[PDB]
Each structure stands twice: as C-alpha cells, then as structure tokens.
Design a protein around this ligand. Structure first.
Ligand SMILES: CC1=C(O)[C@@](O)([C@@H]2C[C@H]3OC(=O)[C@H](C)[C@@H]4CCC[C@@]5(CC[C@H](O5)[C@H](O)[C@@]5(C)CC(=O)[C@H](O5)[C@H]5C[C@]6(C)CC[C@](O5)(O6)[C@H]5CC[C@](C)(C[C@@H](C)/C=C(C)/C=C/[C@H]3O2)O5)O4)OCC1
Ligand SMILES: Nc1ncnc2c1ncn2[C@@H]1O[C@H](COP(=O)(O)OP(=O)(O)OP(=O)(O)O)[C@@H](O)[C@H]1O
Ligand SMILES: [Ca+2]
Ligand SMILES: [Ca+2]
Ligand SMILES: [Ca+2]
Ligand SMILES: [Ca+2]
Length: 360
C-alpha cells in the first residue's frame, strides 16, 4: 500500500510499512510566462521565473486539476508506481468539506484507478505514530493548525478546533519584522532565506516580556546568520517574536485565541471523564511545532488554565515533521485495518458517498 500525506506546503509520500516517507517535496505547480508546468522540486528550482499555485490551501484541496498533477507526480515521478496496482491511503484535514471527500474518492478510483483506498484524519495518524490511541493533538503545518482530541482511536468531532495561523504566516511575519529592523527581502530567493532563518534560529520564549528585556539590554540572545551571498545579519529578538504569534495571534492582526487557549477549549468540550487522559497526552505534530521551547511554553500555559491538581504532559516527538505520514504507514500496515479499505467493488456499487460510511 501507498501512503500519501498532502499538506498545504509539503507532500509526504511513501510505502506502507516503511519508517519514513521516501518522498518529501513542495506542494506546488509552477507556470512560466506565456511563450508548460512544473511540479514539486522542479518548480521550486525555477520559482523566480514561475508563478506558483498551491493546490492545497489551509489543508483543503482547492485546485483539483493541479492536485491531480501533484498526485500523478507523486505516483509516477516520486514513488515510481502505477496507482492501479496499490491500495492508497490518503490523509485529510480534521475538518474537510463533504464534497471534497467525495471528489478525492472519485478521482482516486476513476482517474487513478486505485484498487482500494482510505482517507484518514492527519492529527489522528500523528497520535498513532506516538504510540497512543487516546490524547489531544496539536497539528500545525504551513497552512493551518488544528486541535484534535481523540479517544480509543477516534477523533471527537464536535471538540475539534481550527486556527488559520500556521507556518507561512510566521514566515511572512518574520520577513515583516526583519524588514522593520532595516533588512530587505523582496525576491523569491530572499523569501526562501527568511524561511530558513525561521527554521534554523527561531525559538519560543518561556516568557515574552522577560525575554524582550534580555534582548534589549544584552547581546546574549543574538545570532549571526550568513546569507548564501556572504551578507551577515544579526537576528535578535526576532528569533522569539516570530513564533510568539502562536500564543498571541494579535501580533499579526488576528483576533483568534492562541494555541494554548484552543487546546484548553478543545479539552473542555470533551466528556469530563476523559479530560485527565487528554491533559496527560498533549502530542505536538507538524513542522510549525518544531520551535525549540514550544513544549515548555505549552506546559506553562496549559498549567495556568487547567485545574491545579491536573497532571499536564506535552509530548513533542523528534520526528513530528513526519508523524502524520508515519501514523499512516502504521495504520495501512495493520492486519485488522484491511477490512477498512474502500475497495473498487465497493466504489463501483456505492459511488463517492461511500467515503462517508467507511472513513471516520
Ligand atoms: C468524518 C469527517 C468529518 O467530520 C468532516 O467532513 C467534517 C464534517 C464537516 O463538519 C462541519 O460542517 C462543521 C465544520 C463541524 C460540524 C460539527 C461541529 C463543528 C466541529 C468544529 C466546530 O463545530 C466549529 O466549527 C468550531 C468551534 C471549530 C473552530 O475552531 C471554530 O468553530 C472555527 C474557527 C474558524 C477559524 C472559522 C470557522 C472554522 O471553525 O475555523 C472552521 C469550520 C469549518 C471551516 C469553515 C473550514 C472548512 C474548510 C471545512 C468545513 C466546512 C468542514 C466541514 C466538515 O468536516 O473552518 O463543526 O471532516 C473530515 C472527516
Ligand atoms: N525547525 C522548524 N522550526 C519552525 N518551523 C518549521 C521547522 N521545520 C519546518 N517548519 C515549518 O513547518 C511547515 C511545514 O510543516 P508540515 O509539513 O507539517 O506542513 P504541511 O503539512 O505542508 O501544511 P498543513 O499541515 O498546514 O497543510 C513550514 O511552514 C515550515 O517552514
Ligand atoms: Ca499537514
Ligand atoms: Ca518573478
Ligand atoms: Ca489576542
Ligand atoms: Ca499543579
């Protein structure tokens, strides 16, 4: 079986039973000026002269014709398989419109002619990858963030929380605040530099004000960053001002609650008798949870919101850029799961609506 985890920013793809995805590449289709399209790494290589479309926006497929290009590029170019020969497990956002679930299903069976398929919620797979079937996942990628409380293997759908804020917003904000410091980032290459700075040097402060005071009065938190061309810039408080936005979205003009508040509110929407287990099993997933210090800050903030006697545990797996995929690999490899696939026969009989009955 194949496991394909389609994100807003990155596709992660591979073979069920493997440790790790074999392919990880940008979820883009690029087009040159009129007077021809490029997908994935090919498009990234030529970004300066292409216009890019991201077929997934905030975790939701929005450009179906380019999504098919991504899927075809995944099967043919990246995995070197004919999808007609392999059951395929795909992933979806924790909140995904009904019409989109049916369309994905229709495309896989009618266009790619898969023998079987399944679609799983991304956060749930991440929980499985941490060795759990109960817990609350915070999954934050390039395009969207969700909180998903999960009990005995299944998400509690009414308690799911969504935040628009994710990694691309953070890159944009780092670019803004570095521009304010006096630097310039106006080309596509310069934007890529900002994303690298974010990934290499940003961290979450335990307390914003205290950290700002340290940065104000000392060079102790400053890091030199060398650009590819040899310019050197000093990144100081921008290191932690950037991801502080996750806890205080007002930094980018969003009125939304922060990720600690959404986690708490999600837990509070669950049966009182499962909350202890959720608080003790807060699992972080996705690239935007990779910031150093994020677990300690979440611990602090959840402790401030939760009952005084509650045990709070935040789990941040080292491999969490890839946990959704890894969970898919686990699930697709389970003998007891093989009854759960939608088969071509089932599709032929029931049509796209079959996904409602088989995938939850
Ligand atoms: C089996 C399966 C499903 O349950 C499902 O196919 C469900 C069934 C649908 O439920 C649905 O039709 C409802 C969404 C679902 C039904 C059960 C109750 C519930 C679950 C979530 C919750 O109420 C409510 O929306 C909350 C509290 C969640 C939340 O963070 C805020 O409102 C906010 C903030 C904002 C920043 C602004 C609004 C939004 O929620 O985000 C979310 C709400 C949905 C959307 C507009 C995003 C679009 C892309 C997704 C939609 C409309 C998805 C709808 C469905 O997904 O953005 O809504 O997801 C995939 C897997
Ligand atoms: N070490 C790091 N520190 C901060 N951010 C990181 C780090 N590594 C990766 N990222 C960010 O994580 C994001 C990509 O993560 P991921 O692959 O989980 O997202 P996705 O699945 O493409 O998006 P989404 O889940 O929102 O649809 C990017 O914004 C990227 O810059
Ligand atoms: Ca993702
Ligand atoms: Ca250009
Ligand atoms: Ca606020
Ligand atoms: Ca306590």
């Amino acid at each position: 079986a194949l496991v394909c985890d389609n994100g807003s920013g990155l596709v992660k793809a591979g073979f069920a039973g493997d440790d790790a995805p074999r392919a990880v590449f940008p979820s883009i289709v690029g087009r040159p000026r009129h007077q021809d399209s490029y997908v994935g790494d090919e498009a990234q290589s030529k970004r300066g002269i292409l216009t890019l479309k991201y077929p997934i926006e905030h975790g939701i497929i929005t450009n179906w014709d380019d999504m098919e290009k991504i899927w075809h590029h995944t099967f043919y170019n990246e995995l070197r398989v004919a999808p007609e020969e392999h059951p395929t497990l795909l992933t979806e956002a924790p909140l995904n419109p009904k019409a989109n679930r049916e369309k994905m299903t229709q495309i896989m069976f009618e266009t790619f002619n898969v023998p079987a398929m399944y679609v799983a919620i991304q956060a749930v797979l991440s929980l499985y990858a941490s060795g759990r079937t109960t817990g609350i996942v915070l999954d934050s990628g390039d395009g969207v963030t969700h909180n998903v409380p999960i009990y005995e293997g299944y998400a509690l759908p009414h308690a799911i929380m969504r935040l628009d804020l994710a990694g691309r917003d953070l890159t944009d904000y780092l670019m803004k605040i570095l521009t304010e410091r006096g630097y310039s980032f106006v080309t596509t290459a310069e934007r890529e530099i900002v994303r690298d700075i974010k990934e290499k040097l940003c961290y979450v402060a335990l307390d914003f004000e205290n950290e700002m005071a340290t940065a104000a009065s000392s060079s102790s938190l400053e890091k030199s960053y060398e650009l590819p061309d040899g310019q050197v810039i000093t990144i100081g408080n921008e290191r932690f001002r950037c991801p502080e936005t996750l806890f205080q979205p007002s930094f980018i003009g969003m009125e939304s609650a922060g990720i600690h508040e959404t986690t708490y509110n999600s837990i509070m929407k669950c049966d009182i008798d499962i909350r202890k287990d959720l608080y003790a099993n807060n699992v972080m997933s996705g690239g935007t949870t990779m910031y150093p210090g994020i677990a300690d800050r979440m611990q602090k903030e959840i402790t401030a919101l939760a009952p005084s006697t509650m045990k709070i545990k935040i789990i941040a797996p080292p491999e969490r850029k890839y946990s959704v995929w890894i969970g898919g690999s686990i699930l697709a490899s389970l003998s007891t799961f093989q009854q759960m696939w939608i088969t071509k026969q089932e599709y032929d009989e029931a049509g796209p609506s079959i996904v409602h009955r088989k995938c939850f």
